[PDB]
Design a protein around this ligand. Structure first.
Ligand SMILES: *[C@@H]1O[C@H](CO)[C@@H](O)[C@H](O)[C@H]1NC(C)=O
Ligand SMILES: *[C@H]1O[C@H](CO)[C@@H](O)[C@H](O)[C@H]1NC(C)=O
Ligand SMILES: [Pt+2]
Ligand SMILES: [Pt+2]
Length: 265
């Protein structure tokens, strides 16, 4: 039986996880809508070899020792692609071969930075996950190509500072995770004017000092919008905690409680 198939109305799912595969299995019912290839041996894979599956809509290359993934044309309806927990050291330019991609997950890899026109081409993206990588900086105009982005997570990286215009235009942005990095401040106007339902900013050496001021006021207007990331706790039991954003300024003093020792308005 090699993999295993099922049928949920349209769908014709193919599950081939934990199977020491090394390469894509032969049979694969050409008409597969959702293929699961999680936790297998691959090291290398080419979206090209999937070209035969016109209806493939979800691909999970989740945990497959991947170190390289080359992109090539076909795969016009692929909506979600998970490259979770792997080894790629460079973000693959998927924009020219995954036009329908709406959720990309390459979190927990060896990414140290993103190419220039990285997310170019995939202007249908709604969820981007890059948690667990490195990255100290982000290419300018990173999200310009993805105007309808809703969830964005750069949690647990090494971001020192981030563009003052990163979130410009994202009018559907409802979730932003920036926790566990090493950001020291927030550019004036960063959060712009869109209401952010869920923000995670704890675990940063926030250098509160007059520049943090803009961030302070923001933290005050959105105190019930900033939470803390806990293991497997569900938002059903999550509670706000604006005081989780504190200055690493040898204190554990909540920025947002920071008066701003007489500083220029
Ligand atoms: C990111 O933080 C880690 C923490 O252990 C550190 O080892 C690493 O050098 C930092 N960024 C890089 C990879 O330069
Ligand atoms: C794949 O190979 C590994 C290593 O020998 C083995 O433990 C595993 O059982 C094989 N796949 C399965 C789960 O049948
Ligand atoms: Pt083709
Ligand atoms: Pt939560």
């Amino acid at each position: 039986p090699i993999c295993e198939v099922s049928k949920v109305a349209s769908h014709l799912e193919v599950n081939c996880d934990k199977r020491n595969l090394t390469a894509l299995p032969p049979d694969l019912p050409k008409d597969t809508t959702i293929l699961h290839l999680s936790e297998n041996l691959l090291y290398t894979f080419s979206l090209a070899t999937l070209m035969p599956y016109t209806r493939l809509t979800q691909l999970n290359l989740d945990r497959c020792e991947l170190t390289k993934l080359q992109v090539d044309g076909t795969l016009p309806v692929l909506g979600t692609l998970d490259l979770s927990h792997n080894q790629l050291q460079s973000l693959p330019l998927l924009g020219q071969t995954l036009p329908a991609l709406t959720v990309l997950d390459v979190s927990f890899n060896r990414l140290t930075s993103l190419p220039l026109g990285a997310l170019r081409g995939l202007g249908e993206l709604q969820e981007l996950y890059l948690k667990g990588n490195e990255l100290k900086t982000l290419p300018p105009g990173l999200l310009t190509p993805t105007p309808k982005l809703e969830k964005l997570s750069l949690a647990n990286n090494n971001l020192t500072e981030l563009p003052a215009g990163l979130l410009n235009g994202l009018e559907n942005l409802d979730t932003l995770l920036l926790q566990e990095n090493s950001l020291y401040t927030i550019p004036k106007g960063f959060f712009g004017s869109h209401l952010l339902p869920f923000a995670f900013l704890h675990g940063n050496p926030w250098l509160c000092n007059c520049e943090i001021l803009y961030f302070r006021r923001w933290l005050q207007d959105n105190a019930e919008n900033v939470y803390v990331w806990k293991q497997g706790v569900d938002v059903k039991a999550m509670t706000s905690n604006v005081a989780s954003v504190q200055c690493d300024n040898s204190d554990k003093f909540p920025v947002y409680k920071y008066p701003g020792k007489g500083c220029p308005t």
